Amino acid sequence: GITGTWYNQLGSTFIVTAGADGALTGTYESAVGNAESRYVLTGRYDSAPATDGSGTALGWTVAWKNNYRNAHSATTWSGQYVGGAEARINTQWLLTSGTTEANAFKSTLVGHDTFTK
């Protein structure tokens, strides 16, 4: 049940489609940051996970360039899909910015987002 619309604790919107070959496709809208409207994403996931009750591993990427603006940055979300009464996706993310060699030490932010429907 990964396919569908999800929201994280910041109020961002994540619209996902789960391919039977393990593909991920959709749209992302950030409530925060140097962004506006939708941005394209793509990723992959385990299409044959364990049935001992483990969650489903997954990942996806967004580059913050669209028709309206460029932050010159990209984010990847890595985490696992969890089912049951209340399904959620728990992730941790990295946000890298394009920088000069001078400032590369401070190019990457880390954090975590939690998504539900």
Place this chain on the structure above:
Amino acid sequence: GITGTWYNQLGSTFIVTAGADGALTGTYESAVGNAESRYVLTGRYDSAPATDGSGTALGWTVAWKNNYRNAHSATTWSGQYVGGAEARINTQWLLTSGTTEANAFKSTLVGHDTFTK
């Protein structure tokens, strides 16, 4: 600039193609871990970077299931490309595994990879 074959410090081979629309397609082979042979990747990149000399931000994802085996895991690489005499892709990554909720605290590994020609 990005399209082509790259190798990281572990012996792993990353074979990429960067579409002009910001898309990333290719193959990945890991020198290490619960893997063998090639795996499909996909990702995104800033197809309109700065002219001030900044690097080119990008990211990509790999789910470790192919026709030979399934580790039930996925990695995302977030970083930026740097060109010139010595071209490199400098990244940090997240490797998340499918876990029970009891062990979810130990579900995600962190690291860094450097890619060169």
Place this chain on the structure above:
Amino acid sequence: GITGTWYNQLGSTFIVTAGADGALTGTYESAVGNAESRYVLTGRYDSAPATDGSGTALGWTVAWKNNYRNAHSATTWSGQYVGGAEARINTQWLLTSGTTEANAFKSTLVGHDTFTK
């Protein structure tokens, strides 16, 4: 308002004293992992934070060895303290284990802990 007893979402107990010298001293009890009983901690914090409302930056370290056990690992917590009606300490952590360099790529877990009163 840092000194005192805190608990995180795992049910771990974090007992801290904030000295005026920017120092952090205390004990830690983990509800999870290769652990039993208390372990020593020590850290640092901004003893002169902004008055604009920003949080209080801080961090602390724990090596998992005590009279009862040795897990051959260490965790660092980095975050900020936030006061008011409901005070919290928001962190991200790095848990590193001793390994052979062949397995060095799988040496480091990343996570986040939330601490309340």
Place this chain on the structure above:
Amino acid sequence: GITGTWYNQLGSTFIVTAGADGALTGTYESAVGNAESRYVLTGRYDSAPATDGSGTALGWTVAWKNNYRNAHSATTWSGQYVGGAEARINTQWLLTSGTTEANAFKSTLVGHDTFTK
């Protein structure tokens, strides 16, 4: 053999002292960022590590406030010590700034440092 002067790939200086009880004490100077001169550090380490050839786990913290300035920030380094002809300390670090509740998503940087003599 953790005690001694080390430098990272940025040319920052790490002056460390390992107490017999698993304590770490010393000074830190950053070649970069919002800082100048020496800053106090404290941390812990595994004082009875495995003999199978694994590295020694360790960690330490620095709050970026001293007699000359205050960044309102702290960094924690988590990693392990590795001995031999090329003795090194391999780390990943987290750098957190004090922020408002609104800007917390951009409060924490991650990277990696390599220390040698």
